[PDB]
Design a protein around this ligand. Structure first.
Ligand SMILES: CCCCCCCCCCCCCCCCCC(=O)OC[C@H](COP(=O)([O-])OCC(O)COP(=O)([O-])OC[C@@H](COC(=O)CCCCCCCCCCCCCCCCC)OC(=O)CCCCCCCCCCCCCCCCC)OC(=O)CCCCCCCCCCCCCCCCC
Ligand SMILES: CCCCCCCCCCCCCCCCCC(=O)OC[C@H](COP(=O)([O-])OCC(O)COP(=O)([O-])OC[C@@H](COC(=O)CCCCCCCCCCCCCCCCC)OC(=O)CCCCCCCCCCCCCCCCC)OC(=O)CCCCCCCCCCCCCCCCC
Ligand SMILES: CCCCCCCCCCCCCCCCCC(=O)OC[C@H](COP(=O)([O-])OCC(O)COP(=O)([O-])OC[C@@H](COC(=O)CCCCCCCCCCCCCCCCC)OC(=O)CCCCCCCCCCCCCCCCC)OC(=O)CCCCCCCCCCCCCCCCC
Ligand SMILES: CCCCCCCC/C=C\CCCCCCCC(=O)OC[C@H](COP(=O)(O)OCCN)OC(=O)CCCCCCC/C=C\CCCCCCCC
Ligand SMILES: CCCCCCCC/C=C\CCCCCCCC(=O)OC[C@H](COP(=O)(O)OCCN)OC(=O)CCCCCCC/C=C\CCCCCCCC
Ligand SMILES: CCCCCCCCCCCCCCCCCC(=O)OC[C@H](COP(=O)(O)OCCN)OC(=O)CCCCCCCCCCCCCCCCC
Ligand SMILES: *P(=O)(O)OCC(C)(C)[C@H](O)C(=O)NCCC(=O)NCCSC(=O)CCCCCCCCCCCCC
Lengths: 128, 459, 125, 87, 174, 104, 165, 178, 67, 63
């Protein structure tokens, strides 16, 4: 029939094309009800605080606090030296340094060799 | 230099003998007067330095740094009086005393004529800073930040002390004029390699170099506003000043020993800009931007050409002013909502217009926008690096693109969009905060008008 | 654009001329007595008139006359039609000279090809 | 720029559209007539009515809110509330 | 103008053609120039006349500082700090003067390019050669000394250059 | 957040977030100002193939047009004084190889 | 003989008459045709036909500011090319001699674009429906360049900015 | 936007949303009004053809195939109203919306510039302060012990009360504030 | 002038805008025709394009093949 | 009256200031203001020296 649409990571799958959207178990409905209940509880709490007339300040968000804490302060305590982490760190932290060192060293060696051989155009090169 | 040194040692008893409600007024007025007095050091000679006495001298490199320090003190006083309203009189006076001692040590450091006195003073600068951080920081992490800062600096600087006493024993003097006139080439040996390493590593840790910089986000994020202002504006410039001073006796070993540091500086400049792109904390973003700019300054000092040193000096002055202003803006935002998260407060342009203007100007100066002295220094460094090699232009272009990206990302995140609905305690901007921003920004534009005052002795 | 491109590319580039190497024959080859081109404007006159180096061709005198006419009758920018036509006609004559050079090169090349084919046939026979 | 809306204008325009709908008898059409209970339409008819109102007023009514507008008065009140019309 | 030296800053004589109109149409440029002279040039001239009259009543003078020559680093003994100081200061002053000489030559080059306009590649060949020679000498003098340059380092560079020239001459004569 | 529903009454309408709900680890890059992952009318692989094919074909055809240029059936343009030797910066002292143009 | 004639026509003549890249010349001609095509698209879909806007007609272009600004930029769109071309000094040698078909190439391709686009736009009134073509999808979605080049490189840079550095 | 969402969309809701989306995209393809009317009548004919279907599995399969057809045949550039989320005039006036809590931080001179407005504002503030306890009591009385099962809110059951959680909805900024 | 909005009807036009639009359209067409009448060489060319096939070998300096 | 007051200030004062700055300060140092030399055509009269630049030679005129 019609050509199929292939989802990607940067072009996800639409809801209307999801196969699971048309196979709804009775347990799926109760899961959706529980999710809606959680959202409603959080919304009610936030709306009570938000419509409080005597509140002056910022409604602290534990979710935001958890996100900012897990992004910064919770990383090292849960870091373990594994082969994957070791190889990735070694590569991403050392390889670029040696690559750029080799590039600049080769370029400067060629330039200095040209200088010594006296066949590099250095006329008008006054500022350095 | 005594006409500037003694008034600070007189700021001390004035602070301790003034009334309880007049400490801020007196300190601000007399700090501004001392800054005006120190403005007379900018009249420098084209041949040599200003040799006042056997102990102190001034140069085209020291003068702008001294003027910047003396100008930075009253702004720190304004911010401190902002955030220390409920403190006791004795503790307010102690905080002012710490700031005054730090300014005095910085002045004597920038004007010291011997390397050992310079070492003593630039290590003495640690105690007031550590006290300020670990005492008047707001969060728990101030203790760890102070430990990291202190131990990084000292583990860098102790081999510098050993090298300095060794150099004095070998050559007879540590006086800068004598070591400049009587300098001899450094032969390629392991001993000379390690002497070069001791000196350069001390000042690199002070810079900081990439890979030796974690203490900088730790201390800058967790220090109080005045501590953050002094850490970025002046205390990071001690490393650059020292490197521009010691490298007289480190030739020709600097041609061969500078490769790892140049590679670290360039790649870590790229990496810290990329880190700035993905920071959930505003203070951390400002700190990493400082790291990138000082990495560029390190590149300039390491390539070590007359065009690179002028760019290094201009970039140091510009970065000091811009980073101080950014920290002040972020601190006003923090004093509003009591949190450092960048995405917590939004719509601040529709809630506070003139602060949005200050944010815009600070961000435009943070990125190299012509004809600002930031761009002057960055362009001079880029031209010197281009003469050094022709792929440094690739690295510098990448860094400039990422710098603009993260600066405008910060601006758009904090100021644009729609305001947070539940944040209803954002009072209108104070005259004090507006004056702080104006005093941060106007001298930068005037320096743009007159650029030869911050281009160093190589001009 | 033109049939010459088709002939050279989808055909015998050996018989078609090479624009970057033309001419490949001596200027007197086939011309018993050939006259050198005449230049009216002098080097000093062109230098004073500040003609662009591209405009300092053999038609430079007409361009100088046109410029002088335009400067003198400045408000009336429609009073230099004869000078403009003279310059355009000189450029047209130069262009047809270039076309004649191209055609001469083409037929000289094909005549050389015919001569070499005849010599090869004679050698074979 | 454009003249402000009024409740009377909104009601007149929605009744205009409904009277130009063929499936609705203009004589028995009142502002309180229900689209399915007493007008005899169905879900697709109501969807087309909502689309016609969207075309009329130049703005979109989301599907979550449009399913509940079963009366011309309900549509008028929704549009007035969304456009901040109080008179 | 006597403000600057015509020999140090040469200007070719200015040849301006006379107007040769060919139409009866008036010249808007001429009319606007007359208006400009009537409305701007006369008021600014009167203002400057008043200002110069005020300046002439309080005439006073300033002078150009003269420095006598002092022994150079070649004459200075080893670790003779006072002689080294004097020689280094003199070398720095000479370096500044040479930089300004190069600046003067570059100004000549730029002015000649702009003046000659569309015929600059030929008419500015004289100023290009002077710039080439001056820049060659300046580069040979202070090309790659470094950020911490000094008279001692420049003398070492000159000694190296002299040794290279002597070796080249000996090899050529061999 | 671009994939998130725009018609819902979010607590943070611009970020499309609610108060208290978990925040994605990569929210800082998935905001509406940044990287988007919403479905497209054409598949990602098809889009990549079409874009790459277009750019590669254009580059190949530019190279083909460079090796087969378009010109006119004319000879080289001729300039009077040894192809304007002195006006292009030629050395007055040295004698250029003469360039002679004839009539045709 | 309008303001765009005194520049575009000379540009096309110079492109056709020079030692240029053949693909560049062909793409320039096709771009001129497509310029005519999209101008026809704008005119046809914005001014011709029956209204497709909401019933409340608020159309009013009787403001002196708007009228006078468009007037001033309208006199330039007719006469400024002639004045500028006839008042500037000659700074390039003209292409006086060229074949008649090459002289009329710009007009011919412009008219062909006009006609083809007009026919394609006229086919829209037919009661005929067909799903779009791959070429149409490529052209409408901007060659898919903004999608891929704004989602992939940005994702990779922002992911390396956090995961690695 | 004004209505609290449910836990899921019913089959009727899904098919109605598909009908509206298909009609809108068809209108995007069929620019002219008569052509759009013709093809929209044909689309409604298809929907009517599949209207009466007792087999729910077959109905869901038809819906899924229709969704795939819509995704294949959707307009790459569908028409969007200017104020709609994809529209060009979307969120243009959000920077102009300022809240009343920001309004009450004004200087006394600024407040004196508007004497009659702030009297009514104080009346509204008194009305808000005199009803919060009743609103919270009503909310906590009517909620189930487990918690709020949905985001819906009740009206005022009493003659003198106000609907709970009303302040920001009632005092939200105007759609064209400045 | 005040233009009353119309509902489902053609807008109220003004004689001034009508005559201005007509005048400027007529001005454009007059300019086109007037320019084409005077200088039509800008469109149709000014000089003939020579045919190289008609140039004789004698004037092109081509000798006989046998020679 | 408004146009006259606007014109005198906004146009007259800046042109006075800039003309004074250029004539007496900018054109007091060499090479600050450099004019491209005017074009000299054959059959002209240089006004500096009353000189007559001669005409070009006889053209090989066609038609
Ligand atoms: C300033 C700018 C920035 C600068 C850069 C900054 C960042 C970069 C620098 C830092 C880089 C990382 C630090 C260095 C490595 C530290 C490793 C460590 O502490 O491990 C403790 C950590 C804890 O020990 P454990 O709990 O017993 O093991 C837990 C493992 O999860 C379970 O272990 P397992 O039993 O699964 O192990 C299986 C396998 C794990 O390894 C692999 O699967 C990778 C195999 C390839 C790597 C080795 C290549 C060379 C092999 C030949 C060597 C010949 C030598 C002669 O083992 C082997 O392959 C055998 C050992 C190989 C040793 C090679 C060296 C000798 O152990 C590991 O992580 C195991 C792997 C260790 C090696 C990882 C690869 C290193 C590659 C070189 C890096 C330089
Ligand atoms: C491990 C992989 C590795 O060697 O990475 C080097 C690499 C240096 O960059 P590079 O561009 O590869 O070096 C250029 C040439 O390969 C090497 O340069 P070259 O061949 O032109 O000769 C110069 C060389 C002369 O070579 C020597 O002197 C070799 C003898 C041993 C010297 C040890 C000096 C230690 C100084 C304190 C280091 C504290 C850390 O200079 C050095 O070795 C400088 C030593 C200090 C480097 C920077 C120290 C701060 C690191 C910050 C991140 C720490 C984590 O990364 C590091 O040193 C830090 C990350 C690895 C740890
Ligand atoms: C890797 C490839 C790289 C290629 C690089 C080079 C690219 C060159 C591109 C050349 C220009 C292509 C123009 C058409 C593409 C866009 C079509 C489109 O979407 O239109 C919808 C669009 C209408 O938008 P809409 O209102 O949304 O309508 C929805 C559609 O109806 C919805 O209906 P639809 O979706 O069915 O409509 C599209 C359909 C209908 O459109 C057309 O038929 C347009 C035809 C344009 C004219 C072509 C023939 C020209 C013949 C000239 C003959 C005289 C030459 C001169 C010499 C005379 C004396 C000997 O078009 C096609 O099916 C193909 C058209 C031609 C494609 C050319 C590119 C090929 C790509 C690779 C092959 C793909 C083949 C399979 C297709 C995809 C899979 C199914 O059309 C227009 O607005 C008008 C289009 C322009 C018409 C005038 C074009 C003049 C310039 C081109 C012709 C050359 C003239 C001379 C130049 C100078 C020579 C010296
Ligand atoms: C033979 C020569 C070598 C001999 C030793 C040489 C010493 C080299 C320099 C030493 C630096 C001194 C700092 C280390 C002190 C010990 C730290 C320690 O014990 O780790 C545990 C300690 C936690 O325990 P406590 O704070 O004591 O209290 C726990 C409460 N339940 O860990 C910490 O968090 C403290 C970290 C201190 C600052 C981090 C180190 C700073 C950087 C170190 C390297 C310097 C970089 C150089 C540039
Ligand atoms: C564990 C491995 C540690 C590696 C890092 C090195 C730090 C440990 C310090 C121990 C000393 C190791 C190096 C010793 C070098 C040395 O002593 O010689 C230098 C030379 C000796 O010459 P003479 O004795 O007179 O010989 C006469 C020849 N006829 O003396 C000098 O130049 C003074 C140098 C001071 C010692 C420097 C030692 C440290 C080297 C620089 C590293 C800086 C690290 C900074 C820390 C920040 C980041 C962690
Ligand atoms: C439409 C499809 C076009 C396909 C064209 C295929 C390539 C043609 C080709 O190879 O021509 C040979 C040569 C140019 O080819 P070249 O650049 O050497 O690259 C060879 C690598 N495959 O070209 C030649 O030998 C001909 C050179 C003609 C020069 C014209 C003037 C410049
Ligand atoms: P009202 O409440 O009366 O609604 C009646 C409904 C429809 C709810 C029925 O009661 C019902 O549930 N019937 C059974 C379920 C059913 O009808 N399923 C079929 C739904 S899809 C269908 O069959 C029609 C799809 C065909 C058209 C698809 C459109 C795709 C083309 C779009 C391309 C985009 C541009 C044109």
């Amino acid at each position: 029939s019609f050509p199929k649409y292939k989802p990607s990571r940067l072009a996800t799958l639409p809801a209307t094309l999801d196969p699971a959207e048309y196979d709804i178990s009775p347990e799926t409905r109760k899961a959706q009800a529980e999710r809606l209940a959680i959202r409603s509880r959080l919304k009610r709490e936030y709306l009570l605080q938000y419509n409080d007339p005597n509140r002056l300040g910022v409604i602290e968000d534990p979710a935001l606090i958890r996100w900012t804490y897990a992004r910064s302060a919770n990383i090292y305590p849960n870091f373990r030296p594994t082969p994957k982490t070791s190889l990735l760190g070694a590569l991403f932290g050392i390889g670029p340094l040696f690559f750029w060192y080799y590039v600049f060293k080769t370029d400067r060696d060629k330039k200095e060799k040209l200088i010594q051989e006296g066949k590099l155009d250095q006329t008008f090169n006054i500022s350095y | 230099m005594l006409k500037i040194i003694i008034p600070t040692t007189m700021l001390l008893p004035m602070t301790w003998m003034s009334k309880h409600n007049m400490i801020w007024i007196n300190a601000t007025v007399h700090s501004l007067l001392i800054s005006l007095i120190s403005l007379s050091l900018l009249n420098q000679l084209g041949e040599n330095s200003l040799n006042f006495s056997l102990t102190f001298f001034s140069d085209s490199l020291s003068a702008p740094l001294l003027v910047l320090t003396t100008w930075l003190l009253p702004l720190m006083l304004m911010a401190s009086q902002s955030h220390l309203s409920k403190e006791t009189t004795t503790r307010k006076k102690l905080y002012i005393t710490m700031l005054i001692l730090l300014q005095l040590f910085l002045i004597m450091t920038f004007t010291a004529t011997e390397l050992i006195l310079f070492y003593i003073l630039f290590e003495a600068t640690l105690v007031p800073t550590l006290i300020i951080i670990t005492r008047w920081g707001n969060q728990t992490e101030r203790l760890n930040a102070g430990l990291y800062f202190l131990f990084y600096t000292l583990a860098g600087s102790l081999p510098l002390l050993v090298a300095l006493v060794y150099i004095q024993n070998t050559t007879g003097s540590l006086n800068f004029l004598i070591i400049h006139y009587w300098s001899h080439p450094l032969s390629n040996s392991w001993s000379n390699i390690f002497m070069w390493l001791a000196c350069i590593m001390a000042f690199m840790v002070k810079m900081p170099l990439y890979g030796l910089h974690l203490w900088l986000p730790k201390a800058h994020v967790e220090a109080p506003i005045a501590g953050s202002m002094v850490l970025a504006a002046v205390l990071l410039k001690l490393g650059g000043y020292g490197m521009m001073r010691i490298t007289t006796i480190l030739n020709p070993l600097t041609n061969y020993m500078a490769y790892p540091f140049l590679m670290l500086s360039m790649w870590g400049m790229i990496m810290t800009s990329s880190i700035c792109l993905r920071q959930t904390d505003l203070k951390s973003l400002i700190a990493y931007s400082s790291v990138s700019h000082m990495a560029l300054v390190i590149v300039a000092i390491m390539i070590q050409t007359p065009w690179s040193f002028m760019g290094a000096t201009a970039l140091m002055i510009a970065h000091g002013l811009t980073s101080s202003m950014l920290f002040c803006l972020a601190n006003t935002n923090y004093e509003r909502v009591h949190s450092r998260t960048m995405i917590l407060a939004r719509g601040l342009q529709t809630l506070l217009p003139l602060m949005a203007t200050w944010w815009l100007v600070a961000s435009l100066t943070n990125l190299a926008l012509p004809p600002s002295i930031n761009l002057i220094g960055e362009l001079f460094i880029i031209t010197a690096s281009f003469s050094w090699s022709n792929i440094t232009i690739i690295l510098m272009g990448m860094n400039m693109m990422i710098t603009a990206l993260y600066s405008l990302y910060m601006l758009i995140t904090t100021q644009r969009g729609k305001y947070t609905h539940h944040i209803n305690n954002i009072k209108p901007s104070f005259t004090r905060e507006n004056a702080l921003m104006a005093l941060h920004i106007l001298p930068l534009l005037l320096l743009t008008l007159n650029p030869k005052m911050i281009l160093g002795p190589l001009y | 654009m033109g049939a010459h491109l088709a002939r050279r590319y989808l055909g015998d580039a050996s018989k078609e001329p090479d624009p970057l190497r033309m001419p490949t024959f001596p200027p007197d080859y086939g011309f018993p007595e050939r006259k050198e081109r005449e230049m009216v404007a002098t080097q000093q006159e062109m230098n004073d008139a500040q003609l662009m180096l591209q405009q300092r061709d053999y038609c430079a005198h007409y361009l100088i006359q046109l410029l002088k006419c335009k400067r003198d009758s400045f408000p009336n920018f429609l009073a230099c039609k004869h000078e403009q036509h003279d310059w355009d006609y000189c450029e047209h004559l130069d262009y047809v000279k270039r076309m004649k050079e191209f055609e001469r090169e083409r037929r000289l090349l094909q005549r050389k090809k015919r001569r070499e084919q005849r010599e090869a046939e004679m050698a074979r026979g | 720029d454009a003249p402000p809306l009024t409740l009377e204008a909104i009601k007149d325009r929605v009744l205009y559209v409904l009277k130009l709908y063929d499936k609705i008898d203009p004589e028995k059409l009142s502002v309180n007539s229900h689209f399915m209970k007493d007008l005899g339409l169905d879900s697709l008819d109501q969807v087309e009515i909502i689309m016609a109102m969207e075309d009329e007023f130049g703005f979109e009514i989301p599907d979550i809110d449009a399913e509940k507008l079963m009366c011309p008065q309900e549509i008028v009140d929704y549009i007035a509330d969304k456009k901040d019309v109080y008179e | 103008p006597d403000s600057w030296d015509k020999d140090v800053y040469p200007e070719p004589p200015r040849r301006t053609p006379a107007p040769a109109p060919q139409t009866s149409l008036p010249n808007p440029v001429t009319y606007l120039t007359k208006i400009f002279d009537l409305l701007v040039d006369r008021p600014v001239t009167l203002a400057r006349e008043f200002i110069e009259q005020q300046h002439a009543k309080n005439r006073y003078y300033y002078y150009h500082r003269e420095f006598r020559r002092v022994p150079d680093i070649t004459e200075c003994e080893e670790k003779d700090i006072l002689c080294m100081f004097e020689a280094e200061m003199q070398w720095r002053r000479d370096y500044k003067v040479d930089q300004e000489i190069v600046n003067i030559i570059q100004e000549r080059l730029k002015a000649c390019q702009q003046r000659e306009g569309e015929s600059y590649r030929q008419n500015c060949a004289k100023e290009l050669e002077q710039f080439t020679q001056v820049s060659k000498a300046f580069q040979d003098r202070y090309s790659d000394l470094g950020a911490h340059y000094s008279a001692r380092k420049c003398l070492a560079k000159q000694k190296q250059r002299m040794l290279a020239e002597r070796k080249a001459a000996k090899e050529a004569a061999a | 957040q671009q994939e998130r529903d725009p018609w819902y009454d979010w607590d943070h309408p611009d970020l499309r977030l609610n108060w208290g709900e978990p925040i994605h680890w990569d929210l800082d890059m998935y905001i509406r100002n940044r990287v988007d992952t919403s479905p497209t009318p054409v598949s990602w692989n098809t889009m990549c193939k079409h874009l790459f094919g277009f750019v590669a074909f254009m580059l190949f055809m530019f190279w083909v047009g460079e090796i087969y240029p378009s010109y006119q059936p004319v000879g080289p343009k001729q300039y009077p004084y040894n192809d304007l030797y002195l006006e292009r910066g030629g050395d007055p002292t040295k004698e250029p190889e003469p360039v002679v143009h004839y009539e045709i | 003989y309008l303001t765009g004639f005194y520049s575009k026509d000379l540009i096309i003549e110079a492109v056709n008459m020079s030692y240029t890249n053949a693909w560049a010349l062909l793409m320039t001609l096709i771009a001129t045709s497509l310029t005519a095509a999209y101008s026809t698209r704008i005119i046809f879909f914005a001014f011709l036909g029956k209204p497709r806007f909401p019933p409340l007609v608020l159309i009013n272009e009787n403001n002196p500011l708007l009228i006078n600004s468009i007037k001033r930029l309208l006199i330039g769109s007719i006469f400024a090319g002639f004045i500028i071309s006839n008042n500037i000094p000659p700074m390039t040698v003209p292409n006086t001699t060229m074949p008649l078909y090459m002289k009329m190439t710009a007009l011919i391709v412009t008219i062909m674009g006009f006609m083809l686009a007009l026919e394609l736009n006229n086919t829209t009134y037919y009661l005929k429906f067909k799903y779009p073509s791959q070429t149409y999808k490529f052209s409408n979605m901007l060659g898919y360049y903004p999608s891929i080049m704004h989602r992939l490189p940005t994702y990779h840079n922002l992911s390396m900015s956090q995961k690695s550095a | 936007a004004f209505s609290a969402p449910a836990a899921y969309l019913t089959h009727q809701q899904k098919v109605l949303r598909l009908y509206k989306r298909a009609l809108r995209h068809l209108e995007s393809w069929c620019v002219h009004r008569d052509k759009y009317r013709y093809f929209a009548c044909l689309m409604r004919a298809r929907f009517d053809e599949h209207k009466n279907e007792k087999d729910m599995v077959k109905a869901t399969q038809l819906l899924r195939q229709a969704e795939e057809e819509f995704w294949y045949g959707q307009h790459p550039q569908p028409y969007i109203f200017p104020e709609s989320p994809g529209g060009t005039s979307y969120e243009r006036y959000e920077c102009y919306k300022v809240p009343e809590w920001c309004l009450d931080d004004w200087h006394p001179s600024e407040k004196a510039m508007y004497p009659d407005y702030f009297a009514k504002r104080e009346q509204w503030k008194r009305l808000r302060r005199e009803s919060w306890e009743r609103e919270v009591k009503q909310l906590q009385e009517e909620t189930p012990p487990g918690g709020p099962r949905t985001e819906a809110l009740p009206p005022a059951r009493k003659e003198g009360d106000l609907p709970p959680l009303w302040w920001h909805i009632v005092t939200r900024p105007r759609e064209r504030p400045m | 002038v005040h233009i009353e909005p119309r509902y489902r009807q053609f807008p109220q036009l003004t004689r001034s805008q009508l005559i201005q639009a007509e005048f400027f359209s007529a001005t454009m067409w007059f300019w086109i025709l007037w320019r084409f009448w005077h200088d039509s060489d800008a469109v149709l060319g000014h000089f003939p394009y020579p045919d190289p096939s008609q140039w004789t070998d004698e004037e092109l300096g081509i000798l006989p093949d046998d020679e | 009256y408004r146009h006259s007051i606007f014109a005198v200030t906004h146009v007259l004062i800046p042109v006075w200031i800039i003309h004074y700055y250029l004539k007496y300060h900018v054109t007091a140092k060499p090479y600050t203001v450099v004019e491209r030399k005017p074009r000299i055509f054959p059959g002209d009269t240089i006004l500096e020296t009353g000189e007559v630049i001669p005409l070009m030679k006889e053209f090989p005129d066609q038609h």
